[PDB]
Structure formats: C-alpha cells, structure tokens
Amino acid sequence: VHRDTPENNPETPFDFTPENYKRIEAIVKNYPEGHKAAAVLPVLDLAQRQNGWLPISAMNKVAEILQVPPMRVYEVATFYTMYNRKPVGKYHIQVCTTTPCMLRNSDSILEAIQKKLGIKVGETTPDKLFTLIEVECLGACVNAPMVQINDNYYEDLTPKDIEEIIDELKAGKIPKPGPRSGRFSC
Amino acid sequence: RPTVRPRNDVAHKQLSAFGEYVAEILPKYVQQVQVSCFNELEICIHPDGVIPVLTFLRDHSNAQFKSLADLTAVDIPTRQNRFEIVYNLLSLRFNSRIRVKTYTDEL
Amino acid sequence: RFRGEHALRRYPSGEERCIACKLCEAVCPAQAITIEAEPRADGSRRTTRYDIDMTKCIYCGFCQEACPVDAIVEGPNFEFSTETHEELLYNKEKLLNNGDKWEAEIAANIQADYLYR
Amino acid sequence: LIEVFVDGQSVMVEPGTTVLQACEKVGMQIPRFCYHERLSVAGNCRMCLVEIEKAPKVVAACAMPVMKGWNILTNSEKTKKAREGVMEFLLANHPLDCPICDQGGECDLQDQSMMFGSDRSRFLEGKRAVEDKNIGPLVKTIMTRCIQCTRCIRFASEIAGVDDLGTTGRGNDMQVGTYIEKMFMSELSGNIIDICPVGALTXXXXXXXXXXXXXXXXXXXXXXXXXXXXXXXX
Amino acid sequence: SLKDEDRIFTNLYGRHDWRLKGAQSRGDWYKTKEILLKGPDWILGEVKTSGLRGRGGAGFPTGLKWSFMNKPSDGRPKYLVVNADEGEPGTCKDREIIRHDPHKLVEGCLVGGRAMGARAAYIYIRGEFYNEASNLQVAIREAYEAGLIGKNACGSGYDFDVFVVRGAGAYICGEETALIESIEGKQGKPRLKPPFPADVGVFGCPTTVANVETVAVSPTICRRGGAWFASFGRERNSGTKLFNISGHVNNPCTVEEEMSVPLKELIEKHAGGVTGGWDNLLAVIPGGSSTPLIPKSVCETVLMDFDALIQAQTGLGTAAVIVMDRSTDIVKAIARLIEFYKHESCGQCTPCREGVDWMNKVMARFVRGDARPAEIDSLWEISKQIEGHTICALGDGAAWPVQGLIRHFRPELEERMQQFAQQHQ
Amino acid sequence: XXXXXXXXXXXXXXXXXXXXXXXXXXXXXXXXXXXXXXXXXXXXXXXXXXXXXXCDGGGGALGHPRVYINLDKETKTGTCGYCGLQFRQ
Amino acid sequence: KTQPYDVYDQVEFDVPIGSRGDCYDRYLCRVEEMRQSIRIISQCLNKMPPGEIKVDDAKVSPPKRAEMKTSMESLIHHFKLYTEGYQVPPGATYTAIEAPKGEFGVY
Ligand SMILES: Cc1cc2nc3c(=O)[nH]c(=O)nc-3n(C[C@H](O)[C@H](O)[C@H](O)COP(=O)(O)O)c2cc1C
Ligand code: SF4
Ligand code: SF4
Ligand code: SF4
Ligand code: SF4
Ligand code: SF4
Ligand code: FES
Ligand code: FES
Ligand SMILES: [Zn+2]
C-alpha cells in the first residue's frame, strides 16, 4: 500500500508539537524568505521525530503552517522513504540487503534476527518495541552488515553479536558504530 | 526483409526507359505528366487530342500493344476539373501494362 | 465450422458473454447488426439494444472473428422460414439468446476451433 | 528569428520555440503524450524523442528547443527504432481493456501503436493492477487504464485551480489519484476527462453509451452558460 | 609514469581524532584568508590548471562544471549545492567524508563560495544516516559562532551561510536535476535536463551540483600546489579518489588510493577472499552499481582511472569494488542490483517505471530457471534501449549491469535454464 | 418478474397502456431464460493469495483476454471486466 | 506463364491452344484445360512448406485468437484492423489474374 489511506481511527485525530513550534518556525527561515516550500520537507522529518506514526490530518496541519496546497504536501511525503507511513514502535530497525552487503552474507543476519526478535520480516512486534523492514542501503558500506535503528546506525555484527545487541536494546541503549573492527582502516 | 517486401525493384529502371522514350517526342499536345511506380506506368493526356495518343502504342515498331482492353473513369470533386477517364492497356507481344488518363472536367 | 443462423453464446456460470463494443457493428459489411449499450443495474455494463437483420447479412463469420469474447458463434443452422420480414429479422437478443437449443452443438464445434483445425 | 532545416526543408521559427512547435511549421506531427497547446511543457514519458544530424543521444521534443541551426529528421532510422521501443514499455504494464474501455478509436495510445509501435509481437509477462480511485459525479475514473503521466497532474494545478492529482508511489505502483478519499470539485474540472489520452478518465453520465466508431459529429455553440462556442455533438 | 599508492599523501587523513580545533593542527583552513583575498577568476583557474575529474558517478570534469556557470550578470541571487547522501550501494564515501572529518566538508563550501559567487551554501544528507548528519550540524555551530564563515569572516567581502537538510533517501540525491527539486520542496523527481542545466535554473536560482568527495578536494587543491594534485594518475584523468571494497573479502575496509592504479594491487593490500585472481572466480565490478562486472581474464590490465576504464567494457564512475567469490551466486547477485533500481525508480520516464519493473520480473525467472534459452538474446535489445531514451542518469545505471550478463558470461546463465528444463519438465 | 402479461428480460418495457405492442398477440413473444443475471451472483467468490490476480475463462480456447485485478480495499470485492467473478484477499 | 502471381513458373502448366475460332475448338480447349489441371493440384500436394497462414506483421492481418487474449499490442491492432480499415498507401494500381472466364482487372 502506498496510494490508499484508511479513514477509520486515523483520519481526523491529530496533534502538533507546541514546545517545538518555535523551533519549527526557525527552520523555515533557513531557506529563502519569499516563496518557501522547502520548510515542508523539513517539517515532515520533524513531525516523525516528535510524534510516532504520522497522521493524514497531521500533514494537513503542517501544510497550513507553511501555507501550501494540501494535496501537494501530502504527495511530497509519499515519495520519501525515510518518513513513517502507518505505524512504528519504540526502536525500529531497518536491515540492508543490497549486493555490496549480500556478497559477504547479509541474509544470514536478517534470518537470525527474525527468529530471535520474533515475526516473519514485514510484520512488527505485537507489544510494540521493535519493527523490521527491508532497506535499500544504510549509507555506510564500510562494514559487511549494516542496520540502522532509530537514528544511529549499527555496523559490523556477527551471527550471535546481532542477537545479543537486540536483546540488550530492550532496556538500555546499545550505542555502537562498527563493533567488529577498526573504523577507518583494518 | 523476407515477408515484409513483395518484390525488389529491378525492372523499374527498365520501365523508366518508356518514361523517357515517349517523352523524347515531347508534345505539349500529348505528353504532360509521366508517373511510374510499383512496376507500372501512368500517363495523363491533354483533352484536345486523345485519338492520336491511342493510334500510338497501337502497332508501332518499338512497342506493340494493340489491346486497349479495359476502360475505367474516376470521380473526384477536389480538383477544379472533375472527372478522370482512365484507360488500361495491355500488350501480348511485348508483355507490359501502360495507363492513359484524361485531365479535363469533361462535362 | 459452418455459418448459418446467428446465436449469441454465454458463460458456463450464467452471465451474457457479449460485452458491448460496437466492434462487430463496424466490421459488418451488410450493416445488419445494430448495438446500443446501457449500464446493467449497478457495476456491470453489457448491452440493451441488439438487433441482427436477416433481411440483410451476407454471412461472413466476420462478426465471429472480430469478437474478442466469442459471443456470436455461428452454429450449424438450416431451419428458418417465416411469413413476414418482421418474423424473420431478429429482435433485441431474446431469440438470439433462445439459441440455447443450438449452443450445445456450438460448445462442441468451438472445441474444434481453438487452435484452428 | 533563426531558421533551421527540419527534414531538409527549411522553416523559420522563434528563438525560444520548441522542437515539436517547429515541426508543426513543416507540417509533421510527432508522437505526443504531454500536450503542446495549453498545458505546461514537461517530460516524464520520453516518447517524442528525435535524433539530430550529429548527436549521440536523442532529445525530447517538449523540453529541448531548436536554438541553433541544427538538422533534425522525423523519419530517421534512430527515431523509428526509438518509437517502436517506447510503445512496448508503455504496454508492458497495461491492463487490456480495449473492448470494454470507454474510449476506442478516440484513444491516442490506441492509434500510436498502429502508426508507430511494433506490430508483430510484444514481450511481456505479468502486469500490475492499481485500485480504483474515488470520484464524484463526473468521470468514472479507473487507475488501472492510466499510463501514469503528467497531463492531468498539471491540469488541476494550473488550468483548474484546485490541486488533487499527483504522485502516490515510486515504481510501477504510483497512482494518479488524490490519495486521500475526497470527491473532485466542479468549477471547470469536468473537462479533465477529455484531456486524458488513455481510457482512464471518461464521463460517467455517457459511459459505454456509444463508441467513437459510428458517430456523426456536428459543431454547435452551447446554449447553457454564456460565451460558449464550438462544441462537437455526436 | 607509473603511479604509486598513497605514499604519505591523502586529501582527508584525520578520522581517529577530529572535532573542531584538533583538525586545525593537522592541515585545516591554513590559507583561508589567502583564498578569500584572491579574486574569483584566479581561484577558479587553480582548479582548471590542476585538471581534477568529478568524484561523483558521471565522468564529467570538475573544472569544466564549476566554470560552466561563471555568472557574468545575475538577476536572481546564486546558491551553492552539495550532495553527501549515499546514492549507489557499495560506497563508503558518505559515512567518511562527513562522519569522520566534518571540518573538511564545511571548508569546501567556503572555498567554492567566493569562486562560484553564491550567497548561501546548502548540503543534503541521507535520512538513514542520522548519526553522520548530526556531525555535520555540530560543525556548522562551531564555524558560524566562532568566525569561519558567515557575513564577514577571514577578511572576506562575500557572505556565505551553510545549512544542512535531511533527505528522503532515494533517487532525489542521485541525479543532478533531482537535488534541485528535492531541496525546493517538491516531490522526489528530476527536472528536464536537455533545455536547462543547473546553471540556467535550479530552485529559482543559478546553481551548481557537487559531490561530497569533489567539494572536499577543493580546499586541499587551493592550499597546496597545483602540480601536487596532477602528479598522481594519468594524463587525461588525475587526482586521488576514495575507493571502497565490499562483499567477499578477508577484510572489508575503505582506503584512499591514487588514480591509474591496477585492480590486483589494490585488492592485495586490503586482502580479499581466497585469491586475487587465481583460485577464486573474478566477478568484481569497477563501479558501485552503475558499471557492469569485470571479466576474469581482463582485470590486471584495468586501471582505476576513468579514461583507462572506458577502453574495456564500461568506465568506472562511482569507483567502488564489489568483489564476489566463486562459491557465491552470480545470477542472484546481479538480479538484486536491478531490484535496487525497482525501489529507487522515481516514476516519470515510461521506459523506467514500467521498464525496470518489467526488467526485474524477467530477471527473477532466471534464478528459478523457467526462462527460455531464446529469452536471453531478446533481453539484450531491451537493456540497450533504456540507456538512451531516459531523462536522468539512473536509467543508464540500471541499463549497464544487465549488458554485463550477455557480455563476458552467457554459459553461466544457460546452465541455470538447462538444469530446471530436465528436472521439472 | 412480469408486468401485466409480457415478461421483462434484460431490462425491457412492454407497453404503456397497450399502444406500441400489437404484433405480439397471436404469436408468443420471445424471452431469454434467466436474463436477470442471477447466475452471475450465484457463482462463489474465489480466495486470492497474491496482491494482483490474472483472470481467464478457460485458457486460449474460451474467449477471454487477460486482465489483472487489484485487491487493496477490504470492503467491496474486485471483479474483472469480462466476468462477474469476485476476488478477496 | 508471362506474369506470376503467387509462386508460379515453379508449378508446371499446360495451356491448350487450337486452330479454328469456332465454338467446337473453343470447347475442346476447356476440356483440355480440365485434364491438364490436376497436374497443378498434384504438384500443390507435393510442395507444401509448413509455416505462417497470415502475414506476421499485424498492420495488415489480424493476429491469432490465443495470441490476442494475452498480449496487449495484438488486441489493439485487432481493434483497429476491424472497424477502421488498413490505412492504405495512396496510388492507382491495376492487377489482372487469369479467370477461367477471362480476367478480373481490378483498378
Ligand atoms: C545511480 C546514480 C546515483 C548517483 N548518486 C549520487 C550521489 O548520491 N551524490 C552525488 O554527489 N552524485 C551522485 N551521482 C552523480 C551525479 O550525476 C552528480 O549529480 C553529478 O553529475 C556529478 O558531478 P559532481 O561530481 O560534481 O557532483 C549519481 C549518479 C548515478 C548514475
Ligand atoms: S458480439 Fe462480441 S464484438 Fe460484438 S458487441 Fe458483443 S462482445 Fe463486442
Ligand atoms: S455474418 Fe457478416 S453480414 Fe452477417 S452479421 Fe456477421 S459480419 Fe454482418
Ligand atoms: S486506454 Fe486505449 S489502448 Fe488502453 S485499453 Fe483503453 S482504449 Fe485500449
Ligand atoms: S489519468 Fe490520464 S492524464 Fe492523468 S496521469 Fe493517467 S494517463 Fe496521464
Ligand atoms: S530514468 Fe527513471 S528514475 Fe530517472 S527520471 Fe526517468 S523515471 Fe525517474
Ligand atoms: S510527449 Fe514529449 S515528453 Fe511526453
Ligand atoms: S549497500 Fe548495504 S549499507 Fe550500503
Ligand atoms: Zn474474467
């Protein structure tokens, strides 16, 4: 699903940030003063960070602040892949499956994570804690496996190291960069 | 091409010699326009003399047609001159098909 | 494969096979077939007016060939004799749909028609 | 005004004139999908590709202007190899509606396959289908028949006023619909069905009533609404 | 004539210890006041005299591209554009040029600011790489407040302000026309390239598109001598570019190397899987995702330079090694590369939305083995066609690797079809 | 269903107070059996596994051009252009 | 013998020509045509290459019924070869193929 939007219990109810409203207005000033539609691309990323799972009515309220077309601003977030579509948990992680990562085994890291953290691949956790989704590329391809959770991307993980990092993340943040070898040259 | 083309042009240059030969006489009374396409020859004739064109091709040393067999006419309202009587001629000794047309309105 | 009196076929689970295109209308060299289409109740859009003249029609099988859904299939028919033109020219489907008595033969004949002979 | 020869014949054109606009002066119509009359110039199909006298890559007629005195051929060897190819790409993911489809002969895509595209075969297996978009009174819209172009997208933004149509996905899943469930406004948006080349947007009031084949056309000015003239009635 | 690898020479060396002041001791903003005092014509001439090729996956020279705008007379104020997000998979330049040393990337906008003549500089980062984007935002706060760039800094009349914006993470950072449309606010789709480039009109302004590695090389080329950048490499293409190896390898690591370097020597230094080209079957690609895979026979003769790489099969543009072992599948690997373009297709040009999606569906059948032996030759005609009749360069990027299946290989593809023909049918 | 005397078939009117119809008096008028399209709804809906399903009457033998039908909305099942057959999930 | 239509001269033909222009000799040649016609039919049975029935190019002849139902371009061409005609090249052409009565000079 990409085009269709549900009308039941996620169409009318929406909330906007009040404390971050002053910070959102300053973000619009960073671009051009006259004719500013660039703020809509920045506010869409700020809305997902402040409130989990962006509503259809929430995008219309964000478009009203910058004063833009409601249909055009809704289409702007549809093309983006980083923005949330339906629902996201407390810490959502996306796994890379592209050929630069698949050459040194990437599917083995995803299959081990699927059995340890439950569910198939597309389905999220029923208690809402971890959500799995297939990603194109994480960005940094220096390490053989790559997975980006929430904001900080975790790189370089073994078959048992990936399962140990996932279970520990339930209570306390695990930080990390490439916990397998030197960062620059090894 | 194997199925796309019907026949390659080889006799087209040979039939073009007739497009020169009759035109070498060069009458404003007879010749006017000579069109040749798809192994066939087409001539249109000035209304003043049609009989002298038909006595030609009949007998003649270079080409022997004789049979002035099939005779058609074209109705077209686009031009200022309306009708176009079209003669279809066939040779038995020479084995060729030539066309004689009239350009006049012929009301 | 033999062409006689016209009869329009239907699907095995009800439903009229004719979809209303005006495809067979334009191909028809006699212009015997007439078609005016309206939406059927709700959703479906399949025919309203469907007259084939027997005063016209030179029997080609062109309407059989032009049909993408295979509605008009020419059945082995000989028996047709009337007192008037009115009784002879076919009405809005109905008598064409009454070709069920020949549709059992048509279903057998079309099995020799798919991948031609 | 700078003159540049197209198909050997010379034609005078303006300095900021388009390639397809220059082709009209030479009495030749290139294969189109994105308008040239009133709708804004945009790519997003690459059908109107034409090859220059000395160029490695073909340029689109809607975007690229003539500018300098360069020779461009419409019946070139590279153009015919292009036109047959693009048609196959358009029909690899096309739902096959032709007998059921509201248009038939009036469809611009239907003619271009007969005139330009490859006839003998089309290599395709498995076509994706899109869900039906919501529409009010006029135009019974079907998203499957749509080729996903930019014609009606810019029509709502510029010509009609109120914007609704846009993009929904990324790959072969992007719909031309409104995304949010809302009926289209009246004003002048009833003419959107006549704009679209494919049989996707067509008037619901006169749907499947009569095909383009066998209909006598006559031009007459409309009585309802003032300043209305030239309207063809079948 | 022969090029040596690095040998105490690097564009960006600081990666272990760098914040703001620590980088300054190890060559950063050394001639900041000197470059600002110099004229715009003289500063632009320094890049043209060196002859540095474009770091981004295109092949176009950086000297000609920066001079293409020039700006003789401008009505609307000019703006500077820079791309830092990851485009092609297998590239490590995105999380190294900005993540490790953020001070070097910020200095690149200031060096090209006075040269091009832009009022404000803008940078686009990947949405997935949020940790790397935070380092770039922290560097801007340490530069604007202290007095590095903005209004009047380091004895300069021209004003330049740096601002970083988070991206969607698709083809919006890919094409040069796409970056202008994404930053403006509109949906992720590239503008028409034939009539107007970046110089004529980009977000209502004259602009220029620059890569993350291309922009970072500009202050290093300005501070040091012009001959130093042209010393390593070939006559046509010169300048050190960051190459990253990913896939089947003993140790995967990204390291800076000199131009016109052999593929056998570069793989041996980083250590690959089994053998460099004796025991393990060679399936390495010179590019990240754009260029098709190189043959097993021709690999030692191939060079890192773009001018030398064009002679054999296809030129390297992205400059990233994607080596695959003999045990690893070849058919399934290249099919996944096309599947990347299936998701990263924007939705404009009809031989790409309904093209690549058609291409991936046929390619998925080759893994199973249901495809006919005749279908291999037919697919080659379609693959060549997409390269020519597309607006953006991603249409070419999906077209090239499919051409590398018919070329070089072919018995490998035929064996998969023949195996399922006897077993199932 | 029949109005007065004549039976309606595939949406048809007989006569307004008997004026037009006069020929069908001595001879019995034709009527198509089950022309109300009751057999269309009588057929059971088939379950789908994929997001898009291809429809066919009975291969190349029976006249049915291939159309792909999308299934995205839970309410109202999707049907092909040629058949009255509906698909869910 | 003079003008081939569809694979001629390859098939052996025998043409009966009499002497007198009377009704009896003009009848004998027709019976002699009939006895020397089976030679052609037998040679037609001898030479039959298996292949295409219609022209493969779908701008002239409608495609196969199994073909049109699946592929796209086939049905659109099926929609336009019917209703609409052929879109013929302009020009005047004359053809005559031997009728047993005489000729069919279609113009
Ligand atoms: C598939 C693909 C992805 C690309 N991704 C990027 C990218 O993420 N960043 C970038 O700077 N250039 C990228 N490029 C190169 C662009 O063509 C670039 O905008 C420009 O033309 C190269 O010049 P530059 O090195 O001055 O940026 C990509 C090219 C292709 C074909
Ligand atoms: S008989 Fe066939 S071609 Fe004619 S309208 Fe009905 S479905 Fe269409
Ligand atoms: S058989 Fe020929 S004349 Fe008769 S209805 Fe069909 S197309 Fe028309
Ligand atoms: S859109 Fe045109 S080509 Fe496609 S099915 Fe409808 S009429 Fe045929
Ligand atoms: S509905 Fe028509 S005009 Fe609109 S995008 Fe689709 S094909 Fe183009
Ligand atoms: S080639 Fe593909 S990705 Fe590039 S602009 Fe065209 S449709 Fe979009
Ligand atoms: S018709 Fe010119 S780009 Fe679509
Ligand atoms: S390809 Fe996996 S992180 Fe880039
Ligand atoms: Zn069906």
Per-residue 3-state assignment (H helix, E strand, C coil) for chain E: CCCCCCCCCCCCCCCCCCCCCHHHHCCCCCCHHHHHHCCHHHHHHHHHHHCEECCCCCCCEHHHHHHCCCCCCCCCCCEEEEECCCCCCCCCCCCCCCCCCHHHHHHHHHHCHHHHCCCEEEEEECCCCHHHHHHHHHHHHHHHCCCCCCCCCCCCCCCCEEEEEECCCCCCCCCHHHHHHHHHCCCCCCCCCCCCCCCCCCCCCCEEEEEHHHHHHHHHHHHCCHHHHHCCECCCCECCEEEEECCCECCCCEEEECCCCEHHHHHHHHCECCCCCCCCCCCCCCCCCCCCCCCCCCCCCCECCHHHHCCCCCCCCCCEECCCCCCCCCHHHHHHHHHHHHHCCCCCCHHHHCCHHHHHHHHCHHHHCCCCCCHHHHHHHHHHHHHHCCCCCHHHHHHHHHHHHHCCCCHHHHHHHHHHHHHCC
Radius of gyration of chain F (CA): 20
Residues 6+ apart with CB under 8 A from F54: D126, F66, F67, F68
Q: How far apart are CA C26 and CA G68, in angstroms?
A: 19
Q: How far apart are CA A146 and CA E89, in angstroms?
A: 12
Closest to B50 measured CA to CA, from B70, B64, B30: B30
Q: How far apart are CA E69 and CA E116, in angstroms?
A: 8
Angle at D145 between CA D143 and CA D146, to 5 degrees: 65
Radius of gyration of chain C (CA): 14
Minimum-distance CB partner of G55 among B3, B86, B95: B3
> Separation of D63 CA from ligand 5 center, angstroms?
19
Q: How far is CA D44 from the centre of its chain?
A: 11
Structure tokens at E422: 């006897």
Closest to A62 measured CA to CA, from A44, A89, A50: A44
Residue C117 DSSP SS3:
coil
Radius of gyration of chain E (CA): 22
- The structure's method of determination equals cryo-EM
> Separation of G47 CA from ligand 1 center, angstroms?
63
Closest to E326 measured CA to CA, from E371, E289, E376, E272: E272
Q: How far apart are CA E149 and CA A35, in angstroms?
A: 26
Angle at E227 between CA E226 and CA E229, to 5 degrees: 75
Residue nearest to atom 1 of ligand 3 (CA): C59
DSSP symbol at D85: H
E79 contacts E118 by C-beta, under 8 angstroms: yes
Closest to E165 measured CA to CA, from A154, A44, D168, A19: A44
CATH architecture of C5-116: 2-Layer Sandwich (3.30)
Structure tokens at A144: 């053989």
Angle at E29 between CA E23 and CA E30, to 5 degrees: 105
- Contact: D169, E349; criterion CB under 8 Å: no
E315 contacts E306 by C-beta, under 8 angstroms: yes
Q: How far apart are CA D143 and CA F70, in angstroms?
A: 10
Angle at D171 between CA D129 and CA A83, to 5 degrees: 115
Q: How far apart are CA E53 and CA E229, in angstroms?
A: 11
Q: Is G44 annotated as a binding residue?
A: yes
Q: How far apart are CA A63 and CA E46, in angstroms?
A: 45
What's the resolution in A? Answer: 5.6
Maximum distance among all alpha carbons in chain F?
57
- As a residue count, chain B comes to 107
**What residues line ligand 3, using a CB cutoff of 6 Å?**
C 27-30, 32-33, 52, 57-63
E87 contacts E173 by C-beta, under 8 angstroms: yes
* Chains in contact with E, counting 3 or more C-beta pairs less than 8 Å apart as contact: A, D
* Residues of E within an 8 Å Cβ radius of D: 170, 187-189, 192-195, 342-351, 353-358, 361-362, 378, 382, 385, 388-391
Atom of ligand 5 nearest to the CA of D165: 4
In terms of Cβ atoms closer than 10 Å to its own Cβ (0-12, 13-18, 19+), residue B48 is exposed
Which residue pairs from D178-183 have beta carbons closer than 8 angstroms and sit at least 24 positions apart in sequence? D178/A71, D178/D133, D178/D134, D179/A3, D179/A4, D179/A5, D179/A71, D179/A74, D179/A75, D179/A78, D180/A5, D180/A56, D180/A71, D180/A74, D181/A5, D181/A7, D181/D134, D182/D134, D183/D134, D183/D135, D183/D136, D183/D137
Chain G residues 23-62 within an 8 A CB cutoff of chain F = none
Amino acid identity of residue E80, one-letter, is L
- Contact: A38, E183; criterion CB under 8 Å: yes
Atom of ligand 7 nearest to the CA of D45: 4
Q: How far apart are CA D167 and CA F69, in angstroms?
A: 21
Which residue pairs from A76-79 have beta carbons closer than 8 angstroms and sit at least 24 positions apart in sequence? A76/A40, A76/A41, A76/A44, A76/E185, A76/E186, A76/E187, A77/A44, A78/A2, A78/A3, A78/D166, A78/D167, A78/D168, A78/D169, A78/D179, A78/E187, A79/D167, A79/D170, A79/E168, A79/E170, A79/E172, A79/E187, A79/E188, A79/E189, A79/E346
Structure tokens at G10: 């390859």
Residue A186 DSSP SS3:
coil
DSSP symbol at C8: B
Q: Where are the alpha helices (DSSP H) in chain F?
A: 38-42
Minimum-distance CB partner of F12 among C17, C92, C114: C92
Structure tokens at D105: 């002969």
Chains B and G touch (3+ CB pairs under 8 A): yes
- Contact: F64, G69; criterion CB under 8 Å: yes
Structure tokens at B1: 């091409």
Residue F38 DSSP SS3:
helix
- As a residue count, chain C comes to 117
Q: How far apart are CA E186 and CA A58, in angstroms?
A: 19
E214 contacts E62 by C-beta, under 8 angstroms: yes
The pair phi, psi for residue C115, each rounded to 5°, is 55, 85
E301 contacts E308 by C-beta, under 8 angstroms: no
Structure tokens at D88: 């196959």
Amino acid identity of residue E226, one-letter, is G
Q: How far apart are CA E122 and CA A27, in angstroms?
A: 14
Q: How far apart are CA D58 and CA A168, in angstroms?
A: 57
Q: How far apart are CA D130 and CA F68, in angstroms?
A: 9
Q: How far apart are the first and last CA of chain A?
A: 43
Q: Is A186 annotated as a binding residue?
A: no
The pair phi, psi for residue D182, each rounded to 5°, is -150, 135
Q: How does E213-224 read in b/e, with b if 16+ C-beta sit within 10 Å?
A: bbbbbbbbbbbb
Element (H, E) at D5: strand D2-6
Residue A58 DSSP SS3:
helix
Structure tokens at D225: 């609404």
Domains of chain E, start order: 46-224 (3.40.50.11540), 240-324 (3.10.20.600), 330-424 (1.20.1440.230)
Maximum distance among all alpha carbons in chain G?
63
